[PDB]
Symmetry: C3
Subunit: 270 residues, 3 copies
């Protein structure tokens, strides 16, 4: 049996049931979303995770395969560092952290033949190997005073269930394989400089990438999917999104209000 074996489980006039057994490498990238509150600038409203996409290409047994990965997080805890109510003290209203109770979803899609018309899937199984994700240092750059840095944090992604999924983006709409990863916090705690809380585990959402362009996981899967008989097909994967038009409308309404207010401020000042 080959590492990249292909088998026709069943065939008919218009359809077939191809079994694909591929060895893959999953290169994903955590997505952080940092927003700083107004005022003096010592208060950070949210430090939250975000579904992040990474598009790469790697080397199969002699083949160049373009892959698209999308990492999101499920059930992250909402912690918060608070020092005082005045605008003088550093504060984070809320920041998301990955913990034992949470899960990490990674959706992978490949240019290979195993994904060309993937809609239906038998017996989806895969073996992956765990990985260490260590959080980096992020500097809360204040205009005066110190620069409290959040540091530490480390988790171990351990493989768990696999299902189908979809990868929607402005550019593509892929039918992908989703692997969930349970978690086990590693040893190094995580803490902030000039902060009361210490000796805590997890992975803060500040810079979970921690310098690395990606976290690499080697794995392989085994699926059987209906694809119609011949191969010269283009199921729609490339996309075109014009979604949340009401959201866009209210966003531009807020922007024009902000521009008018700022112009009024400038006119008053000058």
């Amino acid at each position: 049996a080959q590492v990249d074996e292909d088998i026709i489980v069943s065939k008919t006039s218009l359809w077939k049931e191809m079994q694909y057994n591929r060895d893959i490498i999953i290169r994903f990238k955590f997505g952080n979303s940092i927003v700083k509150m107004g005022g003096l600038g010592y208060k950070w409203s949210e430090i939250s995770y975000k579904a992040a996409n990474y598009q790469y290409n790697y080397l199969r047994d002699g083949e160049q395969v373009t892959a698209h990965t999308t990492c999101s997080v499920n059930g992250v805890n909402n912690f918060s560092y608070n020092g005082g109510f005045l605008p003088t003290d550093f504060g984070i209203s809320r920041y998301e952290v990955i913990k034992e109770n949470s899960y990490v979803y990674v959706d992978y899609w490949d240019d290979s033949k195993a994904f060309r018309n993937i809609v239906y899937v038998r017996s989806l199984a895969a073996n992956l190997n765990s990985v260490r994700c260590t959080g980096g240092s992020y500097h809360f750059s204040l205009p005066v005073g110190a620069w409290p840095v959040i540091n530490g944090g480390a988790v171990s992604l351990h493989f768990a269930g696999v299902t189908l999924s979809t990868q929607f983006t402005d550019f593509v709409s892929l039918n992908s394989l989703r692997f969930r990863f349970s978690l086990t916090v590693d040893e190094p705690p995580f803490s902030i400089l000039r902060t009361r809380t210490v000796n805590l585990y997890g992975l803060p959402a500040a810079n979970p990438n921690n310098g690395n362009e990606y976290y690499e996981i080697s794995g392989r899967f085994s699926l059987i999917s209906l694809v119609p008989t011949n191969d010269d097909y283009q199921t729609p994967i490339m996309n075109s999104v014009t979604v949340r038009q009401d959201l866009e409308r209210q966003l531009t309404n807020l922007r024009e209000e902000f521009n008018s207010l700022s112009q009024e401020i400038a006119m008053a000042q000058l």
Copy 2:
């Protein structure tokens, strides 16, 4: 014939053709987006409707069923109550109302076999007993003055066509059943207390839920759908979305610009 029968009508080596009839409970919930204008704080910019999602689960004949619902609206009426031209008095630029000319859409999906690979459907029909929706009270919190309250309003949803559709949320993508609802006004007319606009029918977006956890419609549907021959297949249903990076970037640029403006304001103050 059973309430939840699973009937065949044509079978082939790869594909079959199931007739599904199910008794369902459609629990949905209205959505609203209150956007209050800037200025002195007496003006509201829009009181609109939103396509609101609602997960739940209810007991079938001895077994749980998890359901996903999405209530949206079409053809709303844009009323506008203007207290006066001054920036000191209560005012609303626009608010959406539900009247006869409009429609209410409710998309529905379950974790049962009837939706396992629902991608093609014919002979679709259903019977849904009507329902009534009465709008609750919403207090417009002005900086000074007795709070005006929009209340009243009640509209009865009567059944109309049933068609296929798709529910898209941040986490999932569901091939769902859409139910159309025509509307009839009812006795209590919506209006604002301590206000001039009176005796006008419909339902306003201020609080269509009226403290109800949901609006429940008992119902059943019938459909016939191609699905693969054996039920061990899974079309992708669970989703990851990163669309509108344009809106993401625009909002982030606005955030940083506003942060600079607010920092300048506070620094000038101090």
Copy 3:
């Protein structure tokens, strides 16, 4: 054979392959994102293209067919024009211009039979005559002074490859054909008045319509696709979208605190 030919190239008990050959007219409208920076009002933040929808209907040979089109671009070139570093003079940080290197994607869908269940497609070929898109004139609204105006720009869109795609909107998710258009810049350059730069070719994002309601491209395509034999089968066309709830949350937080700051500013002014 006729202009609107329909064939059955291979039939089976449940599925069949139909070769559809039909004419089309692709009326598509460009999209723009005019964004205003804060400050005195002498600065523009970005003038970029946007994925724009357009729904219409036109008379086929005796029939009246409704159509949906979605225009978008990629690889657009960012040009920056600054009068001077001071904040009193007119300046534009970035505007996006389409040149020979970039492309235009036009996605197209109809009510007609060709798109009833279009998922899998063979041998998709088409013929589209070229079009000429000439930009209009957009007046930049300076606070006080001689309003600078960007005018000109013109590109000939020539046909290129054609593939499948999916148009996502707040109402309908359409399974569509994407036509790729290469570009060749035409004679009349694009220029801003009260300016130093001259005779640079392209099409700026300020106003790619010239007041035109659309750009009409006569067309005819051809494709073979699986559909179920029973023509009563319907794939879900209609849609109900609620993606990117994080954007709603962030925008709402921004608007609430912005209202707070506006209250502070207005009260201080009073």
